[model samples]
Target: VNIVDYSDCFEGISGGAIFCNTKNKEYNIYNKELIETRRSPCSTFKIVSTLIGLEKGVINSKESVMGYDGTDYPNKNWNKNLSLEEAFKESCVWYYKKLINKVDAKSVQNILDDLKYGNCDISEWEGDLKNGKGHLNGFWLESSLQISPKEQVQTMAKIFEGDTNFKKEHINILRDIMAIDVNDANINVYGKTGTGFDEKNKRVDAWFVGMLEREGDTYYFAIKSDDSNKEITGPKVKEIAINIIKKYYS
Candidate 1:
């Protein structure tokens, strides 16, 4: 199939998907409406967040490990100190939130410019407060930053192909963390999962954004899943995405 359709991946889930094979520019897409809808990036922002952190000297891999205070985080993974790779694999929200707090907004905006990621809107950084409006839970959370599924794939293509301003070395670090265990001898997949919520902590949406490398070719992809009245989570969306990918590749 020259143009593939992955609509079934979003079955029973409200969302969309975009799969781009860079070699021939083959695309498998789904759900026009949801593919273009701009929503919070959730934890998938870590892909770029880690890039910014490394370039800004905020993280050096060796010394980039995050420590745990006395806070009793319910997640066992977050309860202990975390290495950069571990934090990303664990999807430690607090760890990355603190990392973002240390970097200036200007630097972040500049990279977003280079990547042309999402709406490139970080206004919520200076515009929210926990008092009444909102908390500074990082713009990429359920706040001002929003990106569509198509745009997610576009940006991933650039980053994965070393077309952005990120240092090749730094990008490699993110690549390492995002690597997934796959049975296909000729294929390797890398991705990040994200979950979003509203002010009351109600789950709103989930994301799985990343790229696939096979036999020297690359495929950039992203999928978002949401249900207005039902529960959707990052891991769940990730499963949906991988299933579609496996079917198409096979």
Candidate 2:
């Protein structure tokens, strides 16, 4: 896949992209090796967490409610009560942290194994330094849990195909929660974004992985950008994806 009008002269940024179809064929890609290079899933891990939470009964239902505990988060929208959809949309960290308690470490690990997610390693769990909370924190961060852009896109494809072992209802809920936009009467976009920062709180990586579905075709994609110090986040990657989709998927 060619990246057009995506370069910034001042920032140290690099990324990868992959586009796949319902038949599991790679139709386009940029930086193929980088697309296969493993990196932290960050909030993108929420995609899997959402599945486990619902299927394992930790999340109960899409409408299952949880309060924000009045924390002063960077995003103002996250400080209120959030249902599954709200939390997923806002990428609320505390909400998922609290949700993780409903399932044991062993069960969570088992689900990861079943899905064959990114080496299936959840080791060296640590605390969230910014939030000062300790509850299964580091697996998807700068820690051991990492996956490639290729793997991410394929995983979404599997989820779409009901090959991830999640129930149809749970998959439907995920599909609903992941919807980012409805382009018109015929096109719909669904996705999750991830932002990763370094020890010094400098932006390191950002990811947007999701799908575009229309009649007769489903397109899955993953985009990751590495930024040395710029505050690149999931939204930035999403913008890139939207541009590319508008150019090619139209």
List clash counts for every candidate, in order.
Answer: 1, 1
Local accuracy of candidate 2 as per-residue lDDT tens digits, 1-250 = 4433433411335676788885656457776777888888899998999888888787767788765578777788778888998888877778887877667889988988777788777775553445555553657866678788988887888888878778999899989889877366576888888887755445476899999887778899898887664667778788877777776676
Give the Cα error of residue 119 in candidate 2, in Å: 2.0
Error of 2 at 195 (Å): 0.4
The positional error of residue 63 in candidate 2, measured at the CA in angstroms, is: 1.0
Looking at model 2, residue 245 earns an lDDT score of: 75
RMSD of each: 2.9, 3.4
Residue 162, model 1: Cα distance from true site in angstroms: 1.0
The candidate that wins on lDDT is 1
lDDT tens string, model 1, 1-250?
Answer: 2445666766677777878877788877777677778888878999988988899887887347756686677789888788888888888877887788889889888889788888999998743355343333667877788888888998999887878878888888888899987666677889989887654534476889998887777889888876664478888888888888788764
User: If scored against the real structure, what TM-score would every candidate get?
Assistant: 0.89, 0.86
Prediction 1 TM-score vs. true: 0.89
